[PDB]
């Protein structure tokens, strides 16, 4: 069809312009994110057994539900956490499962197993939801005047902000982190012990008199305040959200799965604008934590990188062609293909993410390659034979179209298999594959439609002045001619002793194998997200005052030695277990431009935070950067599950856990390996004598009420306007300090009501036990989370954990979860990835060139490029990762292209009659210049990624360095060994001459 | 496209290799089953009202739920049954809806009226389930050491076997039947007479006493809910160990009586997860059971008394073996004729690739590998072989007759046949696709695979138009002079076939010479085909010996569990004496009720078919010996389901007549109307056997409560229920009998053995004050004859009537006749057809319409292929010839016009049509050359003789094994065989002697002329 467009330039221009218009419109309509939809579908099942406690809930509810859900279609795995009187089973389904249909199936199974579950549980009702549990944005209301305090701000948010934020499209759930006033003026057992009451008297009297100030609450006849004289109960600070050492209402925002974070954030901000339009007096919304900002800046940076790559490719193509129009043609080819790729992305639903932009940046050189071939040949014909631009273009098309077709076919074929892979790794592969393949296809189409027309119109007959530059360009031309002569001599040398150089090639293959073995595997690299979390782990049940003081210290440190714009945290909420004395500092860093030095990088900041809070047994303040992929995983470190598949028992499982933790501490590869589960806590066991209950005349439930007045919630009447709370909780437990044990002597209200302290009616034990019980995939498990020590990759850390598991008592498994599971999947997929890519290349070439020998040689070419990629990544110290594997695929494609460039022409000349040796040498010379030109163009197009620096540059460096090294060897080695490969193959298989 | 691939062999090779790899992966991922799911999505709602009258159950549970369900999306119809103590509402949903979403909606609608339902049912909880009552495999653990209790064995199973089986790949559910450990309150029958039972009060005390703290690490670890702890719990002399409980309980939780060959075991049913290979899943289960057996304390021997997977596997084996043997026979025939090993190799390579492509498409669409899929695979391999063999034969004959080199011969042969190939592909597509339009998924599968196998001949349009031409262009080597024809059997056979061809040409010339007579013969063929088609019974699926039979002992409404066990033992002994049963596991309850005391299920696995080869040892005869002879007792209704067909939906002329509409007419009035209607239906000749499937009214006793006197007295109605509970009262439960494990507590008068009948309206009742006053003073017990179960259809109490059409009378005609016979019945009563009747009423004329459409499309396509409006008529006329042989064979065999027969007939039509198209195309080409119609026709007949003979011989010999099948799936195999074999024989002979006549007749009639 090339001739058709040659004679119809207007038609080609029309097609190109239509493509450009479609691209612009698609870009306007295309959603923008950072990463594709890697979030695995997740369904949460929640049940409650108020009449039960921990480890009875697990046996009666958790185990039954998890056994029923076993065998669910698409069920990736199951994590079941059973607390006291509450069971939560999160069933993670594999990527590609309809969340709603999955929830439907879960509900069906839940109804099927409902009968087995305790009737109390059935009446309670087990809920099934699909909401994500990852906070994407936080909202805080701050009153500048200070008129509205925590309770007032919380009421304001609940009245306006809360419902409006839920109304916003794209957010699944808005969680509130505020608190409301209460009036817990109730004594401790020290007070009652000094007295002779079991607090039924006073609590009941307060209830009667309610039917009022805290003083008046205490001053109640049993008007004795002293009997109830305690610290002024006020739950207004109950779950205080500490933003920059201040108290503000916390509004966690969890965006709904499959929702554009940027658009959802924008909608949230607009709704907050309206709420502030109806603000009370001084209240204003101050979002302290956001994720979309890094997404936006990353997209901007990659766009800038793309522009720079385009500039560099123009530079190289000019250096070779040395004429503006000739360089102009491929530069015009580039954007059209990119815009068509954008349109296809919109058609397939692929959102504009960092990965697709990486694909475009890599594409640029591959896109220019074909037009480079076309224009180079047209110029050669227009100079050597002096053909008119039209005639030169026609002849060049006649002699170049086959090469164009072959190169495009091999590239698309190499980018085909990766798309078929599933999982989040499959999604990343799909992004890159779609981008590259569609771009290359459109590049070929333009190289056969637009490029010929431009070569026949834009190109003007070169005169002697342009023919002999007599300058730097002339020097380049003469030097390249000299290099071509030396290259011909070198290729003759390569073919002189084929056995020797083939042995060298086999050595190259061996070195490839060794390098691949040495290179450590890893997942996507870390980046300076601009925000991080400092989990202040505290002893379970420690006074919340200690946690709050520690949080204040953290906030001050972040405001003294760190560049933190927003140091937000929640008291009573943490990934430690969400305990009342557990907090997490959701710190947001300042601008990345301000944070330019290495110390100002988030990693160094976190390291300094750990150092500052090192040597603190009281508070384990562990800082962590935001996970690079917040969907598949939630913790920066690996997710290890210590499954008790053998059923060794809880105590034996704990022994295995502690031994593994000690060995991990010994292991140099591992670091910061900690048990996410909370430690054993003292649990009192009141073995109240039921027969004694019968004798006393107070029911066991009546005795339960007596110990509820001893320890139990009863919210009757509050009046404080601050939060407009009408619930004064009579919780004698929390008020003053009832937590201290009463095993010495409990206090009981007998049938008479004389309030004589309980002597032995309750057999208090005050033992200890686990706060929660965790099972993974139906096996009791302990969640051990660690990280790789500096100088070791994540894959190395995972392998270290696996090795240390060896030696644990039989019955202990090393299950992986979260991002660790995806890393295992990627490591398993990598061999299939490369092997399938090479196989598809071979088959495509075989069908294309109607032979097996030609694809055999082209396949022989690949290991050199693979070698170069490995060499570059090792030299820079980068680990093997998904980006490295994609780079490997690209290098396979480029090496195959460079191989074909020589091999096809050599095959043509050989079939004409030229001796295999002679044809090989002649081809090598003829195709030297196109190979070098295209390879340099592609390499310098990838250079900006390799040399990228700053926020969101680790990924760019990771992919670019490997691609650059591969293309470096995919040319230097190829131009010498491809002739050898073809010669040897032609000797092995008698090609038709 | 042949020219392209002829020039590019490696290209075609690559395409074929891609197809092969895709096929391998598809087979790796394809689901495997016996039959595909055809049943419309059905939701079962079950509820239990402990100790409630059937009429009471209908009034509260059945009616409310049924009424509310009306309105669910695609609710095709609603059927409801109200037994005593439980009710079941089957909601049949129209096909196309997702069963899961329907189940969720049903659950929500049940939630809507949960409150209205009685509190006891609320505690029990309405159970909603997608209809999957398919227990494929059964695992039982017998007391191997003779020292393990049934409940002990069940404990071992639940602890270890249950969870492991749940984890096993492709296991939907592992529901169990084994008896457990539940308490059973066992007071004396004089408890109320002596002092008072008032067991309600003490059981409420049990529930109240069991308590846990509400407030946080502090907790209570004291709760007494066990038989031993019942002496420590306050049970309200009064009842306690400290009070007077005495007789505690026994038999723990009496449950499903599990006896594997009269040996106590534990009931552990297993169902396959839908979409999982049953055979492979069975293998997984077997290995897991091996490991667990090693675990077992040498007394828990695992037994498999039931596994449907075995028959599925053996049938699939039969089919696969048939495929392999067919390929071998094709090799044999092609060597017999061509005598060139490479030429023999070519189709033996081409065919499997097309099969694998069919597998790939099948996986893509979602169709699951089933006996239907594989059986029809064996149908189209002959068609697959046919196209490859005609292509290679045309290539080789040019290499022999002419001196064309393999490449040139391939080019010319493809130039000759390609257009015909395209036309034939289209024709076969248009003859197989219409089968999909049927509302029967059986026909849909038999379409999809056969359609993509004619489009495996379309993959041959990418192989036999691409790969086969390429292979012939390369693998074929020029004939080694005449060395291929030596003095051996091969050469003599070749010479003899040449002589036969000469004789055949002379005979065809003779037939053409007198066309009128042979056309009259063809009309006679039409008449014979018609008459044979008339005299043939209609069926849907031929049953086969699965290797197992199910027995259900239905007994009077309630029989003592001891008596039920006695009858079960009698049946089991009879089976162990006069029947070849490998395993005879018996489980109480189950059957229609599901847990009914009278009901009893016997899963009895037969021996291997080899030892049961004798016809009397076939499952049909074995079931025949049962249900009579030993069985047939008046009260003991022991009936053996004679190998319930996996698609339990096939019904030749079954009428699902439902006298649903009540219109206020009393149950008695509806009974009268039912009797009148069934009598009149018996009288009318259009109708046949008509029965009232509902069980006849059994003796009973009612108790008019003294509710008015209870209003006057202090006796509450709940107090009356408690007095019943004292004497005739059970089904309440307890909790926490063994730790977290939740068991039950059941009040039983006089311990286990009350031994009382006169308790009816005799027991005194102490009032609210406590004064002993017989409720019999005002409450009266009266003998009655009430119905066992109340059935309501679409919200109307109905009498399900099952009938068949009288021989020769149309099913729809008989349904109209049923309606007319009803016409005139008392007002308020109406009819509603269900199941097969309902579907037929919806549409029954699909078949003629799509058949006519297929004929029209074929005619148009042939008109395109021949470039004439007259020539296709001959190809159309060819069709009945093939039908003749299938009809003759099925008549001689006596087999019915089953689905297998019909599909095989369609396949034979396709094969004969392909042959006819080839013949007529070649004849037309020769005519267009200039040769006279007669001579061109003769030449075409001569040429298109050897490929047809080879095709027919290979396919027929491949089909012969199936036509001679011996047990182990014999039914379907022999149906397919008989049909295809007869069609092949007659089709081939009549075609080669008549299609030339057809072309000649058309040419003379319509004045065909040169271009």
PDB file of C-alpha atoms in Angstrom, chain B residues 162-318:
ATOM      1  CA  UNK B 162     -14.454 -33.656  56.975  1.00  0.00           C
ATOM      2  CA  UNK B 163     -11.967 -30.787  56.724  1.00  0.00           C
ATOM      3  CA  UNK B 164      -9.543 -32.607  54.417  1.00  0.00           C
ATOM      4  CA  UNK B 165     -12.343 -33.514  52.004  1.00  0.00           C
ATOM      5  CA  UNK B 166     -13.530 -29.902  52.156  1.00  0.00           C
ATOM      6  CA  UNK B 167     -10.010 -28.839  51.152  1.00  0.00           C
ATOM      7  CA  UNK B 168      -9.908 -31.418  48.334  1.00  0.00           C
ATOM      8  CA  UNK B 169      -9.968 -29.900  44.853  1.00  0.00           C
ATOM      9  CA  UNK B 170     -13.431 -29.493  43.358  1.00  0.00           C
ATOM     10  CA  UNK B 171     -15.541 -30.437  46.393  1.00  0.00           C
ATOM     11  CA  UNK B 172     -18.772 -28.472  46.665  1.00  0.00           C
ATOM     12  CA  UNK B 173     -19.798 -29.809  50.061  1.00  0.00           C
ATOM     13  CA  UNK B 174     -19.156 -32.764  52.342  1.00  0.00           C
ATOM     14  CA  UNK B 175     -22.399 -32.873  54.349  1.00  0.00           C
ATOM     15  CA  UNK B 176     -22.533 -35.751  56.826  1.00  0.00           C
ATOM     16  CA  UNK B 177     -25.118 -38.254  58.028  1.00  0.00           C
ATOM     17  CA  UNK B 178     -23.380 -39.941  60.982  1.00  0.00           C
ATOM     18  CA  UNK B 179     -25.134 -40.019  64.345  1.00  0.00           C
ATOM     19  CA  UNK B 180     -23.844 -37.614  66.996  1.00  0.00           C
ATOM     20  CA  UNK B 181     -23.962 -37.032  70.775  1.00  0.00           C
ATOM     21  CA  UNK B 182     -27.095 -35.118  71.780  1.00  0.00           C
ATOM     22  CA  UNK B 183     -28.918 -35.394  75.088  1.00  0.00           C
ATOM     23  CA  UNK B 184     -32.526 -36.612  75.286  1.00  0.00           C
ATOM     24  CA  UNK B 185     -34.621 -35.710  78.347  1.00  0.00           C
ATOM     25  CA  UNK B 186     -36.128 -39.041  79.441  1.00  0.00           C
ATOM     26  CA  UNK B 187     -38.834 -38.517  82.090  1.00  0.00           C
ATOM     27  CA  UNK B 188     -41.487 -41.017  83.142  1.00  0.00           C
ATOM     28  CA  UNK B 189     -45.030 -40.721  81.730  1.00  0.00           C
ATOM     29  CA  UNK B 190     -46.515 -40.223  85.208  1.00  0.00           C
ATOM     30  CA  UNK B 191     -44.427 -37.091  85.842  1.00  0.00           C
ATOM     31  CA  UNK B 192     -47.402 -34.822  85.210  1.00  0.00           C
ATOM     32  CA  UNK B 193     -49.703 -37.344  86.911  1.00  0.00           C
ATOM     33  CA  UNK B 194     -47.492 -37.771  89.976  1.00  0.00           C
ATOM     34  CA  UNK B 195     -46.333 -34.187  90.442  1.00  0.00           C
ATOM     35  CA  UNK B 196     -45.814 -32.233  87.191  1.00  0.00           C
ATOM     36  CA  UNK B 197     -43.431 -32.283  84.247  1.00  0.00           C
ATOM     37  CA  UNK B 198     -43.617 -28.624  83.144  1.00  0.00           C
ATOM     38  CA  UNK B 199     -40.436 -29.304  81.165  1.00  0.00           C
ATOM     39  CA  UNK B 200     -40.791 -25.928  79.419  1.00  0.00           C
ATOM     40  CA  UNK B 201     -39.976 -24.140  82.675  1.00  0.00           C
ATOM     41  CA  UNK B 202     -36.841 -26.166  83.393  1.00  0.00           C
ATOM     42  CA  UNK B 203     -35.562 -25.938  79.807  1.00  0.00           C
ATOM     43  CA  UNK B 204     -36.030 -22.166  79.977  1.00  0.00           C
ATOM     44  CA  UNK B 205     -34.075 -22.367  83.229  1.00  0.00           C
ATOM     45  CA  UNK B 206     -31.374 -24.258  81.301  1.00  0.00           C
ATOM     46  CA  UNK B 207     -31.139 -21.467  78.746  1.00  0.00           C
ATOM     47  CA  UNK B 208     -31.198 -18.706  81.390  1.00  0.00           C
ATOM     48  CA  UNK B 209     -28.569 -20.394  83.577  1.00  0.00           C
ATOM     49  CA  UNK B 210     -26.133 -20.680  80.675  1.00  0.00           C
ATOM     50  CA  UNK B 211     -24.709 -17.168  80.609  1.00  0.00           C
ATOM     51  CA  UNK B 212     -21.548 -15.233  79.804  1.00  0.00           C
ATOM     52  CA  UNK B 213     -20.236 -11.853  80.894  1.00  0.00           C
ATOM     53  CA  UNK B 214     -21.299  -8.819  78.879  1.00  0.00           C
ATOM     54  CA  UNK B 215     -18.350  -6.616  79.883  1.00  0.00           C
ATOM     55  CA  UNK B 216     -12.854  -5.981  79.144  1.00  0.00           C
ATOM     56  CA  UNK B 217     -10.583  -8.986  79.580  1.00  0.00           C
ATOM     57  CA  UNK B 218     -12.677 -10.155  82.549  1.00  0.00           C
ATOM     58  CA  UNK B 219     -14.946 -13.085  81.694  1.00  0.00           C
ATOM     59  CA  UNK B 220     -16.830 -16.023  83.204  1.00  0.00           C
ATOM     60  CA  UNK B 221     -15.671 -19.542  82.326  1.00  0.00           C
ATOM     61  CA  UNK B 222     -18.512 -21.403  84.077  1.00  0.00           C
ATOM     62  CA  UNK B 223     -21.436 -22.948  82.183  1.00  0.00           C
ATOM     63  CA  UNK B 224     -23.172 -26.273  82.840  1.00  0.00           C
ATOM     64  CA  UNK B 225     -25.060 -27.544  79.788  1.00  0.00           C
ATOM     65  CA  UNK B 226     -24.177 -31.245  79.687  1.00  0.00           C
ATOM     66  CA  UNK B 227     -25.815 -34.514  80.854  1.00  0.00           C
ATOM     67  CA  UNK B 228     -23.263 -34.647  83.657  1.00  0.00           C
ATOM     68  CA  UNK B 229     -23.650 -30.891  84.150  1.00  0.00           C
ATOM     69  CA  UNK B 230     -27.435 -31.337  84.073  1.00  0.00           C
ATOM     70  CA  UNK B 231     -26.991 -32.605  87.616  1.00  0.00           C
ATOM     71  CA  UNK B 232     -25.227 -29.292  88.316  1.00  0.00           C
ATOM     72  CA  UNK B 233     -27.442 -26.928  86.284  1.00  0.00           C
ATOM     73  CA  UNK B 234     -30.749 -26.062  87.994  1.00  0.00           C
ATOM     74  CA  UNK B 235     -33.245 -28.252  86.138  1.00  0.00           C
ATOM     75  CA  UNK B 236     -36.094 -27.154  88.449  1.00  0.00           C
ATOM     76  CA  UNK B 237     -39.596 -34.587  92.996  1.00  0.00           C
ATOM     77  CA  UNK B 238     -38.609 -32.098  90.301  1.00  0.00           C
ATOM     78  CA  UNK B 239     -36.141 -32.814  87.426  1.00  0.00           C
ATOM     79  CA  UNK B 240     -32.405 -32.910  88.200  1.00  0.00           C
ATOM     80  CA  UNK B 241     -29.783 -35.371  89.345  1.00  0.00           C
ATOM     81  CA  UNK B 242     -30.275 -33.690  92.744  1.00  0.00           C
ATOM     82  CA  UNK B 243     -34.007 -33.628  91.940  1.00  0.00           C
ATOM     83  CA  UNK B 244     -35.550 -36.537  90.049  1.00  0.00           C
ATOM     84  CA  UNK B 245     -34.308 -36.864  86.467  1.00  0.00           C
ATOM     85  CA  UNK B 246     -33.305 -40.554  86.763  1.00  0.00           C
ATOM     86  CA  UNK B 247     -33.415 -41.951  83.212  1.00  0.00           C
ATOM     87  CA  UNK B 248     -31.016 -39.563  81.479  1.00  0.00           C
ATOM     88  CA  UNK B 249     -30.872 -40.441  77.759  1.00  0.00           C
ATOM     89  CA  UNK B 250     -29.456 -42.993  75.343  1.00  0.00           C
ATOM     90  CA  UNK B 251     -28.240 -43.597  71.799  1.00  0.00           C
ATOM     91  CA  UNK B 252     -26.698 -40.110  72.049  1.00  0.00           C
ATOM     92  CA  UNK B 253     -28.094 -38.272  69.016  1.00  0.00           C
ATOM     93  CA  UNK B 254     -29.917 -41.057  67.210  1.00  0.00           C
ATOM     94  CA  UNK B 255     -29.418 -40.364  63.529  1.00  0.00           C
ATOM     95  CA  UNK B 256     -28.976 -41.806  60.051  1.00  0.00           C
ATOM     96  CA  UNK B 257     -28.434 -45.544  60.482  1.00  0.00           C
ATOM     97  CA  UNK B 258     -25.293 -46.153  58.400  1.00  0.00           C
ATOM     98  CA  UNK B 259     -24.547 -49.786  57.486  1.00  0.00           C
ATOM     99  CA  UNK B 260     -21.978 -50.574  54.789  1.00  0.00           C
ATOM    100  CA  UNK B 261     -22.944 -54.127  53.768  1.00  0.00           C
ATOM    101  CA  UNK B 262     -24.591 -54.614  57.181  1.00  0.00           C
ATOM    102  CA  UNK B 263     -21.607 -53.010  58.952  1.00  0.00           C
ATOM    103  CA  UNK B 264     -21.979 -49.820  60.982  1.00  0.00           C
ATOM    104  CA  UNK B 265     -20.233 -46.815  59.433  1.00  0.00           C
ATOM    105  CA  UNK B 266     -20.458 -43.011  59.492  1.00  0.00           C
ATOM    106  CA  UNK B 267     -22.448 -41.081  56.910  1.00  0.00           C
ATOM    107  CA  UNK B 268     -20.200 -38.638  55.018  1.00  0.00           C
ATOM    108  CA  UNK B 269     -21.739 -37.548  51.720  1.00  0.00           C
ATOM    109  CA  UNK B 270     -19.708 -35.690  49.093  1.00  0.00           C
ATOM    110  CA  UNK B 271     -20.787 -33.489  46.179  1.00  0.00           C
ATOM    111  CA  UNK B 272     -18.536 -32.308  43.362  1.00  0.00           C
ATOM    112  CA  UNK B 273     -17.991 -28.584  42.954  1.00  0.00           C
ATOM    113  CA  UNK B 274     -19.781 -27.499  39.747  1.00  0.00           C
ATOM    114  CA  UNK B 275     -17.244 -27.028  36.979  1.00  0.00           C
ATOM    115  CA  UNK B 276     -14.619 -29.495  38.242  1.00  0.00           C
ATOM    116  CA  UNK B 277     -13.413 -32.689  36.570  1.00  0.00           C
ATOM    117  CA  UNK B 278     -15.272 -35.396  38.486  1.00  0.00           C
ATOM    118  CA  UNK B 279     -12.764 -38.158  37.674  1.00  0.00           C
ATOM    119  CA  UNK B 280      -9.713 -36.114  38.670  1.00  0.00           C
ATOM    120  CA  UNK B 281     -11.490 -34.916  41.813  1.00  0.00           C
ATOM    121  CA  UNK B 282     -12.227 -38.554  42.645  1.00  0.00           C
ATOM    122  CA  UNK B 283      -8.518 -39.322  42.267  1.00  0.00           C
ATOM    123  CA  UNK B 284      -7.689 -36.477  44.661  1.00  0.00           C
ATOM    124  CA  UNK B 285     -10.232 -37.793  47.167  1.00  0.00           C
ATOM    125  CA  UNK B 286      -8.785 -41.295  46.869  1.00  0.00           C
ATOM    126  CA  UNK B 287      -5.223 -40.172  47.619  1.00  0.00           C
ATOM    127  CA  UNK B 288      -6.399 -38.008  50.524  1.00  0.00           C
ATOM    128  CA  UNK B 289      -8.389 -40.936  51.901  1.00  0.00           C
ATOM    129  CA  UNK B 290      -5.282 -43.117  51.652  1.00  0.00           C
ATOM    130  CA  UNK B 291      -3.337 -40.657  53.793  1.00  0.00           C
ATOM    131  CA  UNK B 292      -6.197 -40.269  56.280  1.00  0.00           C
ATOM    132  CA  UNK B 293      -6.601 -44.055  56.414  1.00  0.00           C
ATOM    133  CA  UNK B 294      -2.963 -44.301  57.422  1.00  0.00           C
ATOM    134  CA  UNK B 295      -3.877 -41.730  60.081  1.00  0.00           C
ATOM    135  CA  UNK B 296      -6.854 -43.775  61.316  1.00  0.00           C
ATOM    136  CA  UNK B 297      -6.401 -45.740  64.588  1.00  0.00           C
ATOM    137  CA  UNK B 298      -6.789 -49.043  62.705  1.00  0.00           C
ATOM    138  CA  UNK B 299     -10.546 -49.161  63.147  1.00  0.00           C
ATOM    139  CA  UNK B 300     -11.852 -46.516  60.766  1.00  0.00           C
ATOM    140  CA  UNK B 301     -11.388 -48.258  57.392  1.00  0.00           C
ATOM    141  CA  UNK B 302     -12.488 -45.921  54.618  1.00  0.00           C
ATOM    142  CA  UNK B 303     -14.913 -47.327  52.051  1.00  0.00           C
ATOM    143  CA  UNK B 304     -16.304 -45.903  48.820  1.00  0.00           C
ATOM    144  CA  UNK B 305     -19.765 -47.498  48.451  1.00  0.00           C
ATOM    145  CA  UNK B 306     -20.805 -44.946  45.815  1.00  0.00           C
ATOM    146  CA  UNK B 307     -18.897 -42.952  43.193  1.00  0.00           C
ATOM    147  CA  UNK B 308     -20.616 -41.746  40.018  1.00  0.00           C
ATOM    148  CA  UNK B 309     -17.215 -40.739  38.620  1.00  0.00           C
ATOM    149  CA  UNK B 310     -16.439 -44.336  37.627  1.00  0.00           C
ATOM    150  CA  UNK B 311     -19.148 -44.532  34.964  1.00  0.00           C
ATOM    151  CA  UNK B 312     -18.201 -41.097  33.616  1.00  0.00           C
ATOM    152  CA  UNK B 313     -14.567 -42.177  33.338  1.00  0.00           C
ATOM    153  CA  UNK B 314     -15.366 -45.486  31.644  1.00  0.00           C
ATOM    154  CA  UNK B 315     -17.673 -43.798  29.124  1.00  0.00           C
ATOM    155  CA  UNK B 316     -15.019 -41.193  28.309  1.00  0.00           C
ATOM    156  CA  UNK B 317     -12.516 -44.048  27.955  1.00  0.00           C
ATOM    157  CA  UNK B 318     -14.856 -45.818  25.541  1.00  0.00           C
TER     158      UNK B 318
END
